Amino acid sequence: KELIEYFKSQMKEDPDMASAVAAIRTLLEFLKRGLRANLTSAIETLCGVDSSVAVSSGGELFLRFISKIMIERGELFLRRISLSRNKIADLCHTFIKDGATILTHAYSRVVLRVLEAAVAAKKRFSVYVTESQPDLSGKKMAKALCHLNVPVTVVLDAAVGYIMEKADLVIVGAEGVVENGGIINKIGTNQMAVCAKAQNKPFYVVAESFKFVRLFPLNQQDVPDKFKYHPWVDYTAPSLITLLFTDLGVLTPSAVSDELIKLYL
Amino acid sequence: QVPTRKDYGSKVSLFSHLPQYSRQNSLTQFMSIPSSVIHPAMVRLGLQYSQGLVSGSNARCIALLRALQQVIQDYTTPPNEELSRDLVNKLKPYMSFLTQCRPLSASMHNAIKFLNKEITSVGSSKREEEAKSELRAAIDRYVQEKIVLAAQAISRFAYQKISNGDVILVYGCSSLVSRILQEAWTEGRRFRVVVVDSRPWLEGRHTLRSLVHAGVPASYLLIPAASYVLPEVSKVLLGAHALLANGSVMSRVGTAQLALVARAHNVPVLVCCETYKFCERVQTDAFVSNELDDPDDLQCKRGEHVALANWQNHASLRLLNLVYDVTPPELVDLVITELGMIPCSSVPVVLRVKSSD
Secondary structure: OHHHHHHHHHHHOOOOOOHHHHHHHHHHHHHHOOHHHHHHHHHHHOOOOOOOHHHHHHHHHHHHHHOOOHHHHHHHHHHHHHOHHHHHHHHHOOOOOOOOEEEEOOOOHHHHHHHHHHHHOOOOOEEEEEOOOOOOOHHHHHHHHHOOOOOEEEEOHHHOOOOOOOOOEEEEOOOEEOOOOOEEEEOOHHHHHHHHHHOOOOEEEOOOOOOEOOOOOOOOOOOOHHHHOOOOEEEEOHHHOOEEEEOOEEEOOOHHHHHHHHHOO | OOOOOOOOOOOOOOOOOOOEOOOOOOHHHHOOOOOOOOOHHHHHHHHHHHOOOOOOHHHHHHHHHHHHHHHHHOOOOOOOOOHHHHHHHHHHHHHHHHHHHOOOOHHHHHHHHHHHHHHHOOOOOOOHHHHHHHHHHHHHHHHHHHHHHHHHHHHHHHHOOOOOOOEEEEEOOOHHHHHHHHHHHHOOOOOEEEEEEOOOOOOHHHHHHHHHHOOOOEEEEEHHHHHHHOOOOOEEEEEEEEEOOOOOEEEEOOOHHHHHHHHHOOOOEEEEOOHHHEOOOOOOOOOOOOOEOOHHHOOOOOOOOOOOOOOOOOOOOOOOOEOEEOOOOOOOOEEEEOOEEEOHHHHHHHHHHHOOO
16 A cells, blocks of 8 residues: 555654645645546545544545646645645734633644744733643643743643633634534534633634535534544534634635535535 | 692603603692691601702611601600501601602612511500600611611621722612722722713712722723723622512612623622612512603703703603613622622522511
8 A cells, every 4th residue: 555655654754744735645646647537536545544524625625626737736736735824824813912811722733823923923822721631632732832932831621611711712723624614623622612602702713724524413423433433523513613714714604604615515 | 738740751651650750840839838747857858859869779768767767756646546556657648758759769668667567566555755765766776787787797798709909890879889899998909990880870970989089099981881891890899779589689770781791791790788678579670660760861962962952842752761670680690798698599588587587
């Protein structure tokens, strides 16, 4: 299996790199070798390794975007995906006020990008990071934010209702966005959104454009079982979400459905 | 005899059963100058009620009990009649005259109830002046303990809640909340107060002067700026005029509104009420029992273009300024009484344990 080997070579050489980006680069590398489309279809039928929503979402969006201009199409598509994060930070970091109390979920490079863009604009704020422990990743987020020279406090997992009254805004990076405006993320997003709604705090979602999946879960069981695995995945209602921060602009949760209707899956 | 005052203006169709008078005219135009039917202290009390000179909820009760002391001191006993029946039959037109002057607060209702219970329980073997001294001493002890000792107890129970460095929001004019703020500032707490006021009474200026004279840093603003400042406000003090059986808070008209906006900004509200101001009476809206103020009070001078000057010539125009409203009991957190920190659901509990049960 050379596709999984190239995926591991593109994902393990840079630990600050996303998985769906490396998957679309693997699809483009198969498109470099019609026979190229057949090899890309073979490896995308053979890429059933990662259980993330963003990987399969980017694979489906590249499978639609591919359908001799396919290589240049994937080239500027990966150019837009690579230049997405700077537009994410530049459109999102303007909402953080001075002296605010930041609430943050587990480790993701997107919220780290928007916090380093926020401290790049001369802003002072304290960040409360939930530990989020099926595995210690919120500690890794607090360690990577302590190197950023910002005041961070490692918060216990069952204290998001304890610290909600003092955290004025709740900014959480999501790993998958369904059509209505809800998000698929790590399991502690639902309780944080419900405690933010009961305390009237604005719940912000910071995710890119390739995480737009065409799914519609009603309950916590209606998310697919291949993305669940002690679950790793919850679901947040779109009524619990104030705004989204994509590269197309700062969007209300009803705009993702507009983009997916104009895109047609 | 005492006639009825004429209703002034065009009433609200929801408030047609409640009377709406004016402060321009008085009822004593057709009364004798030596006051014979009404006691002279009682007609003095009705004049200082109707003109708006006594507006505080505790000040009306204090002036009521002083006028009742002046009535009982100027009481005589007819032959073959008991004091415990004749004083009951004579104090009812006095309270009717006071009601026709201005609608009574529930503190004054409970004062009438307690005084009627005390003058009902006067023995027949007691003399005239001896029973007069008993009733005056009972009124003195009543106003003494159940004003100042309850005020000091509520002041200590709110002093043990207010911490250092917080901000406090108040509304309206109330001597109890102002005394809490003064005795909290003098005993060592360092805080600043955001004063919320409302039209047309503008009674927030009184507690504003009371907080500046006490050395407290103050902030003054109105109802629409309260929504602007409640994201910075951490604590709201309120002055209750009556507490009902379900836990509702009868106060000034901007109380339930401010409590709802404070809960929307997660700011806990605190009402401060003494236990004689409670009610076995209950209501759920501001429509079935309320006080109607002057319809000529809503007009103001913004330049030289007063629009509500000739408001009575417009047939389809209605003027309304409500005095009292109620809160739903799930919006108010504290009820600070002299027995301790109780919730809103404990008001008939305190009524039971203070009603000899």
